[PDB]
Structures are given as structure tokens and as C-alpha cells.
Ligand binder design. Structure first.
Ligand SMILES: Cn1cnc(Cn2c(=O)nc(Nc3cc4cn(C)nc4cc3Cl)n(Cc3cc(F)c(F)cc3F)c2=O)n1
Ligand SMILES: Cn1cnc(Cn2c(=O)nc(Nc3cc4cn(C)nc4cc3Cl)n(Cc3cc(F)c(F)cc3F)c2=O)n1
Ligand code: NA
Ligand code: NA
Lengths: 301, 301
């Protein structure tokens, strides 16, 4: 028992991280087979970090302006191309440590692990959720550009996020095909994140985790319906709950014998009265960064 | 002069459309070089159209269960793989009519042309916008699955949409890497589109088009600020306006000498009093499916 913010083991990703330098700009890249993926922003200098024309900038470059360091080993760039907001550097050596992988785009509410990197060197691992407003509340310093987010399914690494920038305390990036999450662009303009909301299905999954771990004080005998719940949820800036959400919680309802709409009634009460100085799984706030599948993986293993 | 819902010429796409059959399921595919892209749903029959396990279904198939017709010419499938929600069919002949192309993911508010197809045969072309809730208000009958949406930049076709399903009168699909727009899944569940909103920057671009074409009756001498405008816009279910939006409208402000915040004042009045039986560019509603770039392309050519 117990319940922690648990990340995936990062070994399979650590062996793919490399350093990329173009001029005085250095950042991280992801080396899979004979391609290095990195943010296209690496081809800017201070002169063009506010309104770059990346097609122009990339024309003016040759393969030898790109320095790719895999630890000490230098890799030879033999070709480059741009795909949306990433750069693909073709190199002469296929990474022998290339895991089985795929490139997937995640939806808001889903979670993944982040391997934060500096100078191509892995520094730490953490778990976070894609927020409804398409940012993540990460932890990143200067030099972290190109760090990646991933899940593991079986033996397969699904890459889903590449870090590009920080915007007013939160973080924005792309999928691995170079398409931004959210309405952001890889330049400096007046861009801010939109209003965020609480991920309801995740809050419910976490209340189930609490019950499994013996925290029962918030339960009550009442029930409710989706409509009455969503009416209250909207008032508190909670995502509305659908029938698919109810179905996804199935296995946790089953394991604890508490019906979803039963648990919604408890949630409704928590939202209206607060917790009043009690805690749930060691928190005094309703936590929304654990998916139904995270709970299952951690509570039934 | 004049102003119409104008689509891109579709010749370059028409030569890529093919028919794909697997069993009794037929639909459209997109043939570029030696790969056919189509919705993975084509590997279902009625038995598994409600909760399919696509990895299982695809295991049980061989290359010869796939019938690909390019008009009359039959193409030989020599390999298949799944990428997210599309199928990639490797075939023995590269399409000689393959234009220069790329795969891009568009953002809400952006527009594109749709080439509606049945049995691999192009049937019509129309222009539409990706809505803020990630659906499109298209026009599609049964058999249109696999139809694609695209823009043309110079000589390059940017594919951005592949049609998968209709959900309560509106349409949902993926980008060409197989990732859904919006929170939808390619099965039958209880999924509905979220609340839609009006795309404000597009409404403003269209008011500029009206001025260029001589409709001036809604203008007035007042100005306003972003904050007061967005306060009114929110009440009417209009996307908030940012400083980047203001900058994108630059060229149209320039050409007409009406400042953005000046035009916002007119918009504020239209929202509060209505149009009162007058029309703008032949419409009695505020139109939001024309981007600043659509207006420029059509009004300055
Ligand atoms: C505080 N923080 C949290 N996350 C981030 C991510 N991030 C970053 O690591 N670096 C950035 N700009 C660079 C400056 C450089 C100076 N040198 C010598 N080399 C540099 C390389 C980079 Cl990438 N930025 C800013 C940034 C990066 C982009 F990719 C982009 F499109 C716009 C941006 F404003 C940054 O956010 N910093
Ligand atoms: C009215 N309308 C508007 N757009 C659409 C798109 N669309 C479609 O064309 N076909 C679908 N299902 C199929 C039935 C078939 C019967 N035969 C013999 N062959 C068939 C092939 C198809 Cl693809 N659907 C439904 C649908 C398609 C999906 F890709 C999906 F993931 C879920 C779905 F419910 C459909 O929406 N119809
Ligand atoms: Na209850
Ligand atoms: Na005015």
C-alpha cells in the first residue's frame, strides 16, 4: 500500500539523449536510429529569437554547423530537414541503444513522465499531466529545451512531448512530429496560457485510490446523477463528466464496490464544504494528476 | 471585388485519391509515393464496430485481404502497419501524380479545403474551419470516410485532416499521423462534441473584408481597449482577443485605415444591438470561417 507520484523508469530514454549545438545555442536532442530530433529554435541567435523566419535560417546552414555530442563521442551530421517545429538531423551512426518506440500525441488529462536534461545529460525524472489548457506544470531551468516526455507500454516507449519553452511559470512544447500542444508558437510574442480547469475523472480516480488505501471519511450514503453533478462541477471550474469517464472508472468501482455516481456524491460534498482540515492520501487539496490507469497500475500492480 | 467561400483548386489532391476495401468495408484512401493512408476502422466488420481491439484485428490480416483500386488499376499491397488511428498500406507502385506535400496539424480557427470523396471518386470541394471544440461543420454522407482536408502553399499541398466519423450532425477526424482532433475515439461510445464558441479574430477579418468591398454602415467613431471588449465578448460566447490576434490583423488595418480596436468598437455594438435587418457581405449573421489570411488572399490576391 501507499500512494506516490510515480514516474516510469527512465533507463530506455536516458540512452537516447544527446547534446546539440549550433553556433552558441546548445540544447538537448533525442537520438533514435540514425536521426537526432531537437527543437528547431536551436538554429536561432539573439538577433532572430523574437520573429525568426526558420526557412530562411535553415537555408543558410550546412551540416557542419551542427555539433552533436553523445557524451564524448561526436556524431557526424550528414543531412538535415525541418518538420513543423522540430529539426531532424540525419547522422552517420544509428544509436545502438534505440528502444522499441513510437510517436503518440496525448490528450489533456493524460499523464506522462518527463526526463529533464541539461547539456544532453539526464538530471531528473518526474510525472506530470497535460493540463486542459495544453500546458504542463513542469520543473525546468534554462538549458532544458529538447527534454522529452514519455510513457512505457510493455517494452515500447511512447514519446509524447518535447519541451520548447516556459510561459509565465508553466511549460509548453510539441509532440515529436513538431506540432505544438495548444495555441503557441516557437518565438517570443505576447502569448499566455488560457484558463485552466480541474480534471474531474482524475480527481475521482484519486478518491478511489484513497478508499483502497483506507481513507474513507469522505464517503456518504447519497447518490446523484451526471446532470446534477455537472451542474455543481461547472460552478467550481471542473471539467464535465461524461458516460465514457464513468465507464473508464469501472474497474475501480468494481474493486471497491463504490459506484461512480456514489463517489460523485462524495465529490459534490467535498466541493461544497471543503475538507475542513482533514487530508486525503496526505494532501489537503483534491489532486487531479493521477489517471484511472495510473491508480490501477499503482494499486493493483 | 465580391467575396465568396472560396476553396483551393483540388487537382493535385484528386490524383491521390483511391478506394480501399477490406472484406465488406470500403472507404477512401490517400496514395502518396508508395504508401496508401486510410482510417484504420476499415479493418472492422459490424461485430467489432462498437469496441474493437485494432491490434488484434490487424494481426489476423494479410496483405491480400486489402483491395486498393486506383480507378480501375488494382494496386498490390506488399506490407501494412498501423500508426495511431490510420493504416499505412505499402504498395508496389509509387503514385506518379504525387505532388510536393507535407503533413501539418492545424489549430482551431484555421480554415482548409475538403475534397469529399465516395468509392475513391472525388465528388465536391468546400472550405471549412476547424471549430474551437475540434469538430468541423462539414457536409458528408455515408462512404466519405478517408476524405481529406488540405491547404496549398505555393506548389506544396499541406494535408491536415482525414475524415473518420459524424457525431450528432458534425464531423470529427485526425491529422495524417493518425492523431484525433479533439477528445474522440474511432469506435462507437457516448461521445459528443463540447460547447462551441465564435472565432473572434475571424469575425474581425470578415468585417475588414466588408469595408474593402464597400459595406461601411456598421462603423462608428468610438474606440475601446482589449479588456472592455473581451468582457463583452465573453458574455456572447466569443473567443477572447489577444495582442497576437491584433497583430495578425495588421495588414487589413493598414489597407483600410481602420484600427483594430476601432473595429472592435463596431463589433461590440453589433453584438449588443444586432444588425436589425441589415446585411454584411450578403449575410445576416456574423461570419467566423474566414481567416485574416483568407481575406488577404481573396481581397488583394
Ligand atoms: C526557465 N526555463 C524553463 N524552461 C525553459 C526552456 N527554455 C530554454 O531552455 N532555453 C530557451 N532559450 C535558449 C536560450 C539560450 C542561451 N544559450 C546560450 N543557448 C540557448 C538555447 C535556448 Cl533554447 N528558452 C526560451 C525559448 C525557447 C524556444 F524554443 C522558443 F521557441 C522560444 C523561447 F523563448 C526556454 O524557454 N527555460
Ligand atoms: C453520415 N456520415 C457522415 N460522415 C460519415 C462518415 N462515416 C462513414 O462514411 N462510414 C462509417 N462507417 C462505415 C460503414 C460502412 C458500411 N460499409 C459497407 N462499409 C462501411 C465503412 C464505414 Cl467506414 N461511419 C461510422 C464510423 C466511422 C469510423 F471511422 C469510426 F471510427 C466510427 C464510426 F462509427 C462514418 O462516420 N457518415
Ligand atoms: Na455517496
Ligand atoms: Na469605431
Amino acid at each position: 500500500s501507499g500512494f506516490r507520484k510515480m514516474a516510469f523508469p527512465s533507463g530506455k530514454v536516458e540512452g537516447c539523449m544527446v547534446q546539440v549545438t549550433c553556433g552558441t545555442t546548445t540544447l538537448n536532442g533525442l537520438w533514435l536510429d540514425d536521426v537526432v530530433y531537437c527543437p528547431r529554435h536551436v538554429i536561432c541567435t539573439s538577433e532572430y529569437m523574437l520573429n525568426p523566419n526558420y526557412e530562411d535560417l535553415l537555408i543558410r546552414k550546412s551540416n557542419h554547423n551542427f555539433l552533436v555530442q553523445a557524451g564524448n563521442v561526436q556524431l557526424r551530421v550528414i543531412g538535415h530537414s525541418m518538420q513543423n517545429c522540430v529539426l531532424k538531423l540525419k547522422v552517420d551512426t544509428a544509436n545502438p541503444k534505440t528502444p522499441k518506440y513510437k510517436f503518440v500525441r496525448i490528450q489533456p488529462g493524460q499523464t506522462f513522465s518527463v526526463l529533464a536534461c541539461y547539456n544532453g545529460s539526464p538530471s531528473g525524472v518526474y510525472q506530470c499531466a497535460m493540463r486542459p489548457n495544453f500546458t504542463i506544470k513542469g520543473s525546468f531551468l534554462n538549458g532544458s529545451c529538447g527534454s522529452v516526455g514519455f510513457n512505457i507500454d510493455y517494452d515500447c516507449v511512447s514519446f509524447c512531448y518535447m519541451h520548447h519553452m516556459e510561459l509565465t511559470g508553466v511549460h509548453a512544447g510539441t509532440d515529436l512530429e513538431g506540432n505544438f500542444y495548444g495555441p503557441f508558437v516557437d518565438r517570443q510574442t505576447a502569448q499566455a496560457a488560457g484558463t485552466d480547469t480541474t480534471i474531474t475523472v482524475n480527481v475521482l480516480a484519486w478518491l478511489y485510490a484513497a478508499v483502497i488505501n483506507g481513507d474513507r471519511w469522505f464517503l456518504n450514503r447519497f447518490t446523484t446523477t451526471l446532470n446534477d453533478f455537472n451542474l455543481v462541477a461547472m460552478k467550481y471550474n471542473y471539467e464535465p463528466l461524461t458516460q465514457d469517464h464513468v465507464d473508464i472508472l469501472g474497474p475501480l468501482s468494481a474493486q471497491t464496490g463504490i459506484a461512480v455516481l456514489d463517489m460523485c456524491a462524495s465529490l459534490k460534498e467535498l466541493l461544497q464544504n471543503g475538507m475542513n482540515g482533514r487530508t486525503i492520501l496526505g494532501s489537503a487539496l483534491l489532486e487531479d494528476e493521477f489517471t484511472p490507469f495510473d491508480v490501477v497500475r499503482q494499486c493493483s500492480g
